[PDB]
């Protein structure tokens, strides 16, 4: 079971839902949750930060950005939060309203087996990562964002500014299914 870290955005269910299509259950549970808590349930296969309002308001996911041993997926701003918890920087940015953005895969990891090298994806850019953290490695961008995914260059930490959990985002669910296999799921 993957656990689900409510950061506050409207699309928390949704992770809840598309991971259901393919066959992943999951829990949603509120940003304060202790990382012990979610650790010593040996149900819980790995963590995913789901976006929300702001970045102040989802602290604790900094805690377990840092100390989790368990694999993480961080959604918008959950991306942004794992950026600033390694000591990368955040910030605002023009295209703030939700919008299909052509991403452009740039290392192939993972989250992006049996994706396209180019796809759709429905994302807003508010805010985005300017500095990729160090001891990470940028995976896709788009035109208007350097970093729409990236991941630490040796742990299972990774991070998308797009929604792949909605419909709109191409390959959104065989995205998530690879994040679903470094946590230890198998597909057919």
Avoid at 97 to 116: G, I, S
């Amino acid at each position: 079971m993957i656990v689900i870290l409510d950061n506050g955005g409207q699309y928390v269910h949704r992770i809840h839902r598309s991971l259901k299509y393919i066959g992943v259950s999951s829990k949603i549970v509120p940003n304060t949750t202790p990382l012990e808590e979610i650790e010593s349930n040996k149900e819980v296969k790995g963590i995913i930060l789901s976006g929300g309002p702001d970045i102040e308001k989802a602290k604790n996911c900094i805690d377990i950005a840092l100390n989790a041993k368990l694999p993480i997926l961080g959604i918008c701003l959950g991306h942004q939060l794992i950026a600033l918890a390694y000591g990368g920087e955040v910030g605002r940015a023009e295209a703030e309203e939700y919008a299909l953005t052509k991403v452009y895969v740039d290392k192939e990891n993972d989250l992006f087996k049996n994706v396209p090298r180019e796809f759709n994806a429905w994302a807003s850019h508010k805010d985005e990562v300017k500095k990729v953290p160090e001891g990470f490695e940028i995976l896709a961008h788009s035109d208007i964002c350097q970093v729409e995914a990236m991941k630490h260059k040796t742990k299972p930490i990774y991070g998308v500014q797009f929604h792949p959990e909605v419909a709109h985002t191409e390959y959104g669910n065989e995205i998530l299914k690879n994040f679903c296999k470094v946590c230890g799921y198998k597909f057919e």
